[PDB]
Design an enzyme around this catalytic site. Structure first.
Site: not given
Ligand SMILES: *NC[C@H](*)CS(=O)(=O)NC[C@H]1O[C@@H](n2cnc3c(N)ncnc32)[C@H](O)[C@@H]1O
Ligand SMILES: [Zn+2]
Lengths: 477, 77, 301
Positions: A24, A26, A56, A92, A115-116, A170
């Site tokens: 979202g 990004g 959406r 990644s 994520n952390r 998310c």
């Protein structure tokens, strides 16, 4: 592509920037960058696209389902500005390929992660590269933006992060990292039922539905080994295999049966014409733990999933737009050489007593005690040496808790015995062996290096045979 | 003299504290942190835009009756 | 009866959006994705050489075509369930009958006089009114919902439950023509952000020059803006030293990030209003992208 002074525009047009994450935030960010005049953009994201009119997405539509997030975002934006030089990576960011040399290519790095462990890695990479990092997050109406610069501001890890009790939902996840991603997927699947509509064709067969999204869909994901080259591959399941071979964590057979039980019960609800009813939650527990087992993730109990599922804050796409706009605005000041004007900006739901909906705050200096960005950082770990093995040390204490990617561990004694080697095929046989077999106990020190992250951590050991139920290690300090 | 303070979070949530004006505000912070189930340095507490330090007191910060303390919490989503 | 009713109330709403430049593009995109029953995009202007880029709903190769027409395909593509429509006719010569088909009306790029008229029409017909614009690093949103009712849940207070609430909004004319000679307004003056008076300056520019200040004619626009700064502030009993000279260099053209921010807030306010679920910002929202300020001011009463 001008709207701002000559020096800044030429800085923006000639510079190169990195966006980590193509969800979202990004996708919104990418657009904002190209519309501002950023013409050299790298965009990385590990995940593929899964969308429905239940929720959406901006650049993601039904025709893109199953394709790379970064690639489609690149293609979608190329339609607005055909001239932008966008490099998309379906990977990644924790791949060793994206080393310090890669990070020094950029004059600015922008985070857009969920994520952390990944945020931690980028933090360390950006400090090592000496490159400004813009950190952002969102949950419902709330969110913030901040700037991390080596030797000027605090790093992403200078202060203890609040342990996540509530979970921001998310942009639909396909490749699970955290166990929450499976609970979101199961909750998303539940409201997508109660080929897209395969249940309405097979007659709600709990065996036929099992063999599609837990057999074919994941075997379809194995065609692309972009993720499955250094990271752990997912293991497909067949219904005939599972049949063969409260806070209780149960086995795969029981959750496969509860999956068929839930479907047998919930279809009676469907005959006529929520999450509170047991049968609804029984589905969420099953379909999630099922996906958890497939993606090499430890299965959770009903009690844990129940509270977690209730704590999912629904996404508000409009908030991600606000944050992605704030990121670029912070970016412009940095590339303007006005970092002293940068601010930690918090977004509110309602105006505060001072009538503020956006709250800018001074950037804090480095924390002298931070175990990451301070000079010669040092920690302390209490653990049971007779129980915990090197594999448990590597995968759950050195890599998981302390967020290292490619670590190398030696004992402090003026000898430097290699316990853990990042170079594959060196200390592989040490994994199953207990730590006490290497002369490690109370007072011992471990110098752990992550040469990818360019980071040394000194680990102090205190031994204790008493830890409690389900306790392996405890960080103290 | 004692003063009742309003502590408002980002989600419009509200907790009221009654605190001694000479007592350090670390107690208010550690109490609020315990209520949210979060570590000591996990949130930031502002008054009149200034960050409230552990050894700060209402008297030193000229806090009035019914004044607002603002809480801010980082979102990882 | 529940927050699920607020969902269906939004999904049954038709919105009119005027002005399909940077900000309107953002607003359309947000509202469409949200799932309104339908959105009508109204613009009388054609796409200029410097529009296909800056407006992401416009295709490259659309110069000379109506700005709203050229937006349709991309805009609709976002959500097939939304009834996306276009109107090419001028808003200024649009009859009162036209507006009554919409639940909410959102104006961008319009002159003050058009803003006031449409606002007056909406209030007469119980239609929800919104307006907003971007000027360089600055951007604002205004709402007028009149007598508005909503159900917000109030978080636990200890030393969560739903509650009905009514808020009264005021016309744009009263909100723009605030009298500062009053005793109450004098104490309010110190608390009021200078972005309100900056808005007053840019509105006069737009009404007189027929357009916004532009990067092409920076030096001429910059001189007129300083002249308007004196002619507006002195005609309100306010010392013209509240807006510093350096205001000119931060209010030109349309910064894409600013549209993102202001379009995100405005769209959400439209959603809130239509759903009747959360407390809408009472009156004005002012954003300065150079300082990172987002201020909600209530002016008019
Ligand atoms: N909390 C705000 C929502 C987050 S989001 O905007 O949806 N972004 C999630 C997006 O980021 C990716 N991600 C997560 N971890 C990654 C690593 N290690 N490498 C590349 N991308 C990564 C996810 O793939 C999500 O799509
Ligand atoms: Zn640090």
């Amino acid at each position: 592509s001008r709207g701002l002074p000559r020096e800044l525009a030429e800085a923006v047009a000639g510079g190169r920037v990195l966006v980590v994450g193509a969800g979202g935030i990004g996708c919104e960010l990418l657009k904002n960058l190209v519309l501002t005049g950023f013409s050299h953009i790298d965009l990385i994201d590990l995940d593929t696209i899964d969308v429905s009119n239940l929720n959406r997405q901006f650049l993601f539509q039904k025709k893109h389902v199953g394709r790379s997030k970064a690639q489609v975002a690149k293609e979608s934006v190329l339609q607005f500005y055909p001239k932008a030089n966008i490099v998309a990576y379906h990977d990644s960011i924790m791949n060793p390929d994206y080393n310090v040399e890669f990070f020094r290519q950029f004059i600015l790095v922008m985070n857009a992660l969920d994520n952390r462990a990944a945020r931690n890695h980028v933090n360390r990479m950006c400090l090592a590269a000496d490159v400004p990092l813009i950190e952002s997050g969102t949950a419902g109406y709330l969110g913030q933006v901040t700037t991390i610069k080596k030797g000027v501001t605090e790093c992403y890890e200078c202060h203890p992060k609040p342990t996540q009790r509530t979970f921001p939902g998310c942009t639909i996840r396909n490749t699970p990292s955290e166990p929450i991603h499976c609970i979101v997927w199961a909750k998303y699947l539940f409201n997508q039922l109660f080929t897209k509509e395969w249940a309405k064709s097979t007659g709600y067969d709990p065996v036929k539905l099992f063999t599609k999204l837990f057999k074919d869909d994941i075997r379809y994901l194995l065609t692309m080994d972009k993720l499955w080259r250094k990271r752990k591959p997912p293991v497909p399941l067949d219904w005939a295999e599972v049949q063969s071979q409260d806070q209780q964590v149960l086995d795969v057979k029981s959750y496969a049966r509860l999956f068929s039980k839930s479907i047998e019960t919930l279809r009676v609800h469907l005959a006529e014409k929520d999450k509170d009813d047991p049968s609804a939650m029984d589905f969420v527990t099953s379909a999630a733990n099922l996906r958890m087992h497939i993606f090499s993730m430890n299965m959770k109990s009903r009690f844990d999933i129940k509270s977690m599922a209730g704590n999912i804050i629904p996404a508000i796409a409009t908030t991600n737009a606000v944050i992605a706009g704030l990121i670029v605005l912070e970016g412009l000041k940095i590339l303007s050489g006005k970092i002293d004007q940068c601010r930690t900006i918090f977004l509110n739901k309602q105006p505060n007593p001072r009538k503020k909906l956006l709250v800018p705050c001074a950037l804090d200096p480095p924390n002298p005690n931070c175990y990451v960005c301070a000079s010669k950082p040092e920690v302390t770990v209490r653990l049971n040496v007779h129980k915990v093995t090197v594999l448990t040390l590597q995968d759950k204490i050195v890599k998981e808790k302390f967020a290292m990617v490619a670590p190398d561990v030696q004992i402090e004694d003026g000898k430097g015995t290699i316990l853990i080697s990042s170079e594959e095929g060196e200390t592989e046989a040490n994994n199953h062996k207990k730590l006490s077999e290497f002369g490690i106990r109370n007072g011992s020190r471990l110098q752990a290096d992550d040469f990818l992250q360019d980071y040394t951590l000194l680990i102090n050991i205190l031994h204790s045979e008493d830890l409690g139920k389900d306790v392996e290690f405890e960080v103290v300090g | 003299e004692y003063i009742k303070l309003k502590v408002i979070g980002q989600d419009s949530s509200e907790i009221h504290f009654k605190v001694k004006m000479t007592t350090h505000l670390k107690k208010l912070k550690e109490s609020y942190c315990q209520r949210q189930g979060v570590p000591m340095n996990s949130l930031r507490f502002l008054f009149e835009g200034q960050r409230i330090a552990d050894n700060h007191t209402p008297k030193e910060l000229g806090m009035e009756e019914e004044d607002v303390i603002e809480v801010y919490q980082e979102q990882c989503g | 009866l529940w927050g699920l009713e607020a969902q269906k109330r939004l999904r049954a709403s038709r919105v009119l959006l005027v002005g399909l430049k940077g900000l309107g593009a953002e607003i359309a995109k947000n509202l469409i994705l949200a799932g309104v029953k339908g959105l009508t995009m109204l613009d009388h202007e054609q796409v200029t050489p410097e529009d296909p880029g800056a407006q992401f709903l416009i295709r490259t190769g659309s110069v000379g075509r109506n700005r709203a027409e050229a937006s349709l395909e991309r805009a609709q593509n976002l959500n097939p369930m939304v009834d996306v429509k276009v109107d090419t006719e001028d808003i200024e010569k649009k009859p009162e009958s036209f507006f009554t088909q919409f639940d909410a009306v959102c104006l961008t790029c319009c002159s003050r006089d058009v803003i006031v008229k449409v606002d007056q029409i909406c209030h007469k017909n119980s239609i929800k009114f919104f307006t907003g614009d971007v000027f360089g690093y600055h951007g604002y949103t205004f709402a007028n919902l009149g007598e508005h009712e909503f159900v917000e849940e109030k978080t636990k207070v200890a030393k969560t439950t739903m509650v009905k609430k009514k808020v009264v909004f005021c016309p744009v004319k009263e909100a723009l023509e605030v009298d500062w000679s009053s005793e109450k307004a004098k104490a309010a003056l110190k608390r009021t952000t200078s972005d309100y008076f900056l808005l007053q300056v840019l509105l006069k520019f737009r009404t007189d020059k027929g357009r916004d200040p532009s990067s092409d004619t920076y030096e001429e626009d910059s001189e007129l803006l300083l002249q308007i700064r004196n002619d507006v502030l002195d005609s309100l009993g306010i010392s013209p030293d509240l807006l510093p000279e350096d205001f000119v260099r931060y209010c030109f053209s349309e910064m894409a990030p600013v549209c993102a921010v202001v379009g995100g807030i405005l769209a959400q306010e439209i959603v809130k209003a239509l759903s009747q679920r959360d407390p809408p910002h009472n009156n004005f929202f002012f954003f300065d992208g150079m300082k990172g300020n987002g201020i909600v001011e209530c002016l008019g009463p």
